[PDB]
Amino acid sequence: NLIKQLQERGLVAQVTDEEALAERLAQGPIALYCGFDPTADSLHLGHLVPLLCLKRFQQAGHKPVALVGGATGLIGDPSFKAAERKLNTEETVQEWVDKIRKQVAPFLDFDCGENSAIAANNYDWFGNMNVLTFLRDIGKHFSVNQMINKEAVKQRLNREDQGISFTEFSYNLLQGYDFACLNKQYGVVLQIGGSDQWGNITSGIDLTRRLHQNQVFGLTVPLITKADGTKFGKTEGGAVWLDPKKTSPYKFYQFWINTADADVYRFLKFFTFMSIEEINALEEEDKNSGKAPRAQYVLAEQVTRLVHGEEGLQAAKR
Amino acid sequence: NLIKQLQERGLVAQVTDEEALAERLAQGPIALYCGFDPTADSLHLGHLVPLLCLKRFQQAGHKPVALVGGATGLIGDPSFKAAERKLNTEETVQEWVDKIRKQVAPFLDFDCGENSAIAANNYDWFGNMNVLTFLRDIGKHFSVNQMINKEAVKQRLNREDQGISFTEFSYNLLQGYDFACLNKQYGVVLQIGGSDQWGNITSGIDLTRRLHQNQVFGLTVPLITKADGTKFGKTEGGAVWLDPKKTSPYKFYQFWINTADADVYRFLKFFTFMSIEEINALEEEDKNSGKAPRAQYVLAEQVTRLVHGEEGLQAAKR
Numbered sequence A, B: 001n002l003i004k005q006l007q008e009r010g011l012v013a014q015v016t017d018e019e020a021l022a023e024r025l026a027q028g029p030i031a032l033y034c035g036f037d038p039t040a041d042s043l044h045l046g047h048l049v050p051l052l053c054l055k056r057f058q059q060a061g062h063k064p065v066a067l068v069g070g071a072t073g074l075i076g077d078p079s080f081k082a083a084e085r086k087l088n089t090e091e092t093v094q095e096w097v098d099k100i101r102k103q104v105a106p107f108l109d110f111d112c113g114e115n116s117a118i119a120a121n122n123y124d125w126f127g128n129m130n131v132l133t134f135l136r137d138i139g140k141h142f143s144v145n146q147m148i149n150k151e152a153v154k155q156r157l158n159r160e161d162q163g164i165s166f167t168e169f170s171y172n173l174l175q176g177y178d179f180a181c182l183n184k185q186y187g188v189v190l191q192i193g194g195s196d197q198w199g200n201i202t203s204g205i206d207l208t209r210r211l212h213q214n215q216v217f218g219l220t221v222p223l224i225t226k227a228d229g230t231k232f233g234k235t236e237g238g239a240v241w242l243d244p245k246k247t248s249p250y251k252f253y254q255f256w257i258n259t260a261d262a263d264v265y266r267f268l269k270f271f272t273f274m275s276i277e278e279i280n281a282l283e284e285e286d287k288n289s290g291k292a293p294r295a296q297y298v299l300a301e302q303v304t305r306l307v308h309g310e311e312g313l314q315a316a317k318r
């Protein structure tokens, strides 16, 4: 039902159990979540993909759970990460964490009644948890042998000079517990994220089973990348952030206008909430027409409105 | 000096930096330590070897530091262990810690003067340590790449019949920190133990250097075994404990008095404080004499007195 709708938009990289998941969603409204680690004082285009999916699920009658890694942001996710990561101060991260929680709120409904979104921070439980308690209660459920063969960290253990500290090596467990922890208190039976989080989701699905005996699910979204294969979220000396202070609403609207034809339509399915029909109708429209493709104009006005509202939209034109 | 003296009686299997350690020991009195994890309500003959070396070191004017792993006892040292060591309740380990601590006290002098022994417990700094603090403050200094090639655990990894959990895989770090922690609060520059503890000692030496820029040392005593080869401190009633309640002084004395002629002398160098001379004069004595080797007698006399004193000695004779 819903999963297939997302597949139409091309926002479905993988699914742990496409049938049971599709069935559970049928039985009734479920609660899912997606994590966001503090690596800056603001999120960017890349992050906007998963976040938007949550809203998609919510409009479908589901309850989204946007979580901020106040704790995981202090260790670093090595998932398909070329090299080690910086250990930001406990204060700097806290400052960012508080900026993310507020930057995410507007994107979700926090009072729509039943499926009201909920903001969570893994620091709440990892920020006062003992080390021995962690290793014992959570670590005993992990095999180093299989932790090594996980793609997310594969290269980092085999390769020439790609190493990995014990710090980021345990990240997997942290995000793993998060799933179970959220499932235990909020009944979250689904987690979504980029294709690079598949390994972390898996661990979360497994742990939850041997911890609460609950069949949980995971759904990764494909990592968005420009047709010209040039990553995403970043352009020149400044990755397009969501904070209008780091990326002027005017500079934001311009970024979309500059979208290549080989992407514009694919981007509309990923960053807007337009029915796949009116989107394909727009493509077939720009095709037959001998005029300039108005797809970008649409794509720019849509996203700019979602991130900066009518205000920023009118600001990007003055 | 003292190093070679220990070599004379085969109590030294490995030494990190024999040279530097030699000069340091000569420079003046130092502070060493040896850990003993609570895996039972009592210690056995095997644990007695390293414990005695602490006193031997103390008689040399150095200060021994007998540490009880009130925390590590909850994790489990996998050093050269084929299987996963089951987890004991904090209530049980705590109950064992007290017994071991009081059982160790007698063996060391806790009020002779300056070189008074110290009773340490890693639970003091690991029991109230946040997981996030541990993972980064310590974990960042450890490389999974080299943790995997560690002899102590290389068995549990490169096998398809065995396996190691994240719990015991993180043990090394705990012991590593202990050395650094002790060196920072007591100035402990040396750690001793069985050859199986070499890996844990080394890790504690590099960690101390990376966190305090100090050069500590490590010395491991050979894992004493029986001539035939069978494990040491193991009989039909299980193992030979230092706890009278578990192993009567009578049964304790009989174990020694029944020592093979090929071990009786080594054991005298390992379990007693008789000068290497009188020990050799004793061996030379038995060598050529129609009588029966009185080495066994001497052995059972000495050891039994060190573990159960006069009371337990006269108890074995009745």
Ligand SMILES: Nc1ncnc2c1ncn2[C@@H]1O[C@H](COS(=O)(=O)NC(=O)[C@@H](N)Cc2ccc(O)cc2)[C@@H](O)[C@H]1O
Pocket (backbone or CB within 6 Å): A034, A035, A036, A037, A038, A039, A045, A046, A047, A048, A049, A050, A067, A069, A072, A077, A122, A174, A175, A176, A178, A179, A192, A193, A194, A195, A196, A197, A200, A221, A222, A223, A224, A225, A232, A233
């Ligand atoms: N270009 C892109 N296209 C699609 N998705 C993208 C993307 N760029 C980033 N993302 C996704 O958007 C999110 C960005 O935040 S993130 O720093 O990568 N998140 C993480 O690293 C997770 N470990 C955070 C986390 C998740 C769950 C937890 O229980 C705890 C922590 C991730 O889901 C990432 O996969």
Ligand SMILES: Nc1ncnc2c1ncn2[C@@H]1O[C@H](COS(=O)(=O)NC(=O)[C@@H](N)Cc2ccc(O)cc2)[C@@H](O)[C@H]1O
Pocket (backbone or CB within 6 Å): B034, B035, B036, B037, B038, B039, B045, B046, B047, B048, B049, B050, B067, B069, B072, B077, B122, B174, B175, B176, B178, B179, B192, B193, B194, B195, B196, B197, B200, B221, B222, B223, B224, B225, B232
């Ligand atoms: N038969 C034997 N001959 C000689 N030495 C022996 C022996 N049997 C055991 N030993 C040694 O005597 C001690 C017995 O206690 S133990 O439970 O094995 N100790 C451990 O496992 C350590 N990991 C404990 C530890 C040590 C230091 C720390 O900072 C923290 C913990 C160890 O040093 C062991 O190597």
